[PDB]
């Protein structure tokens, strides 16, 4: 028995190692990221998380990138500069995957990209999964 | 509030427009495909579905690709060649996605690649979404 | 040691206790022995040539 999961839980590419694609989370009420590495890394690779606002000239085109603000939890540390980031540790192996998501939505489009385009940044793939279509 | 959907429904890249990556599905009991196009197409693009099995030399590395066979339904007609195929229509709109799945599993790895590599097959992106874990 | 270079050493083997205890003259009657606890512990921890 198999199901057409893509009907209920579609997924979209977010990072290929050479470019980043904005993902429209507007119609879906929940989402999360997923990471995987296709080769051994040389050091941790930090990723910046952005979001876009609807452009003026068109209601379905993303605007310029806006950096997502941090959100401290019930108690604990806060990011040094008050922003959100994710760091992929060096100990990660090729045959494993990592999952994570931000606590809040903000704009209707979301995106993610590395801090610097180095040789290691090309070894990481990022995919976005959405759940519970609302429209 | 949004959840960490990446923990229960991880997804992986299959075809990013230049390369095809084998996806290991044995750890999950359901899966499906999602097709998105990032601009207008010029003609129909057909895709072949493959599956692999553990290589003789190493039990965690895939062997050469084998092509998935077709299976007909109750009130239906088998395809002429007896092999599974997926074709994306020319009239597909950029701002929508289509999801389809295969009825059977076969080997523990699955893959997908266009029948012909050209300037049109590079406009499509395919991502595989799993469901349920058993390890 | 070896016959070419003998090495005389004081010793106390299992059979010495047996000989000593059994050599008591029979006429004098039943006897009782007195000894230190470590001596009995040493006696009870003997092993033959094979380690048993």
């Amino acid at each position: 028995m198999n199901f057409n999961v893509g009907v209920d839980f579609p997924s979209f590419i977010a990072w290929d190692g050479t470019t980043s694609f904005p993902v429209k989370i507007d119609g879906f009420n929940q989402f999360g990221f997923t990471f995987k590495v296709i080769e051994e890394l040389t050091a941790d690779v930090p990723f910046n998380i952005f979001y876009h606002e609807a452009s003026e000239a068109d209601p379905c085109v993303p605007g310029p990138a806006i950096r997502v603000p941090d959100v401290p939890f019930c108690d604990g540390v806060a990011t040094a500069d008050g922003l959100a980031t994710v760091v992929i540790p060096e100990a990660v192996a090729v045959d494993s995957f990592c999952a994570g998501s931000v606590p809040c939505f903000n704009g209707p489009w979301i995106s993610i990209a590395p801090v610097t385009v180095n040789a290691d940044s090309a070894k990481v793939q990022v995919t976005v999964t959405m759940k519970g279509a609302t429209r | 509030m949004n959840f960490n959907v990446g923990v229960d429904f991880p997804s992986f890249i299959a075809w990013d427009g230049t390369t095809s990556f084998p996806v290991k599905i044995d750890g999950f009991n359901q899966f499906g495909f999602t097709f998105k196009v990032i601009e207008e197409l010029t003609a129909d693009v057909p895709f072949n579905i493959f599956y692999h099995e553990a290589s003789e030399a190493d039990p965690c590395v895939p062997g050469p690709a084998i092509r998935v066979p077709d299976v007909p339904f109750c009130d239906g007609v088998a395809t002429a060649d007896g092999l599974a195929t997926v074709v994306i229509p020319e009239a597909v709109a950029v701002d929508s996605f289509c999801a389809g799945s295969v009825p059977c599993f076969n080997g523990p790895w699955i893959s997908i690649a266009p029948v012909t590599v050209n300037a049109d097959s590079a406009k499509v992106q395919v991502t595989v979404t799993m469901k349920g874990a058993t390890r | 040691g070896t016959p070419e270079n003998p090495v005389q050493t004081p010793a106390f083997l299992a059979q010495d206790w047996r000989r000593f205890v059994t050599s008591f003259p029979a006429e004098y009657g039943d006897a009782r022995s007195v000894m230190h606890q470590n001596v009995f512990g040493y006696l009870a921890a003997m092993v033959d040539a094979n380690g048993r």
């Binding site: 192996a93 995957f97 990592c98 999952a99 | 750890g27 390890r135 | -």
Partner: peptide, 27 residues
């Protein structure tokens, strides 16, 4: 900063030797 969740896709059981006492040799 977000906390990730990690899980492996493959497994390889640890293979450790077991050692046993050597044969008796007089001290």
């Amino acid at each position: 900063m977000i906390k990730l969740n990690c899980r492996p896709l493959c497994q390889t059981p640890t293979a450790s030797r077991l050692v046993s006492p050597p044969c008796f040799i007089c001290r």
